Structure 1
């Protein structure tokens, strides 16, 4: 019946990347989570009037298993490439994540979105103009999200689904 989209979250560790999927899949209005629960990473949603199922792979915490990235990325139809807006290194990592996705998927046009994540109150070091310019150079959308207020979270995932639908 309904379409299932396999989405993969990628990006540097240690800077709050996991908050994006947790806040999406969460009981939006109760701050609670058991990731061990069968289908704590599947969510039925309605995007532009069309019901679909999101299956989200977020291997947050496994970043040091660098030789597994190809295997994990291969499972995805669309990718959220996430950096922290107060961690310049995580932003500089984005280019290599995108190159690796293109290689694994053997395509120069893989559905993906760039996500700038605000994970704390430490001072921002990546300005939105820098990230917009990077996203434009790649031809992909840019979404900024808060790891605490859920702002931008739906927009990030729904924008990616639209990129898949319009591929």
Structure 2
């Protein structure tokens, strides 16, 4: 048992919010810098459920035309898909049918989740009443936002329920192994003291929802 792996392809336009969703799920952080990806980046994610561990291999692809690389050569042997669009720009939503078309012509009968990112921005341009693609294609739609962690775990939960088959599936708490006990050289201890001083000097970012 290779802890049950699956291949997930993340597709969408330029801004959208991929590689920020994946980065928030990987380490936990918000990237405010936009650096377009070249080709694809493969990141493993693990979740724990009442049936055991489930591992996704997220293939975060590039939504830019000139950085596409192997455009559709990534959606081969894929087993699940996420189509992401930005709710603050209607062009990102107009291209959802094209991404779906490119997905279906290479993969047959795979679970696909449609996600609308950047909900928290306000002055939203794609109102929730105008999102009808999931109704037409029998898809599962979610409103997420990687900044506020709103519904940010729902797509993986839905895909986990669909892939093994258990409409009553939950994320159980990750096992907590015993951390090791080690020691450091006194010079590195003094360096850590100086780093602690300079960190305590620095001010934490101002946020909320604690």
TM-score by length of 1: 0.80
> Is contact 2:19-2:60 (8 Å) kept?
yes
* Distance in 1 separating the partners of 2:50 and 2:91: 35
* Distance in 1 separating the partners of 2:163 and 2:100: 16
SS in 2 for 1:41: strand
Which structure is higher in helix share?
1
Structure ranking higher on relative contact order (CA contacts 8 Å, 6+ apart): 1
* Distance in 2 separating the partners of 1:96 and 1:61: 12
Question: Structure 1 residues 118 and 3 mapped into 2: Cα distance closer, same or farther (>3 Å)?
Answer: same
Higher Cα radius of gyration: 2
- Matches for 1:12-91 after TM superposition, within 5 Å: 12-26=13-27, 28=28, 41-60=43-62, 63-66=65-68, 68-91=70-93
CA displacement at 1:65 relative to structure 2: 3.8
In the alignment, structure 1 segments of 5+ residues that lack a partner are: none
* Distance in 2 separating the partners of 1:120 and 1:16: 13
Question: Structure 1 residues 51 and 62 mapped into 2: Cα distance closer, same or farther (>3 Å)?
Answer: same
> Is contact 1:17-1:83 (8 Å) kept?
no
- Matches for 1:105-120 after TM superposition, within 5 Å: 105=107, 107=108, 109-118=109-118
> Is contact 2:42-2:57 (8 Å) kept?
no
Which structure is higher in strand share?
1
CA displacement at 1:13 relative to structure 2: 0.8
* Post-superposition CA distance 1:97-143 (Å, at most 9, x none): 011101011x2x22110000017625211122322x22121111001
* Distance in 2 separating the partners of 1:69 and 1:47: 33
Count residues in correspondence: 156
> Is contact 1:23-1:153 (8 Å) kept?
no
TM-score by length of 2: 0.65
* Distance in 2 separating the partners of 1:61 and 1:67: 10
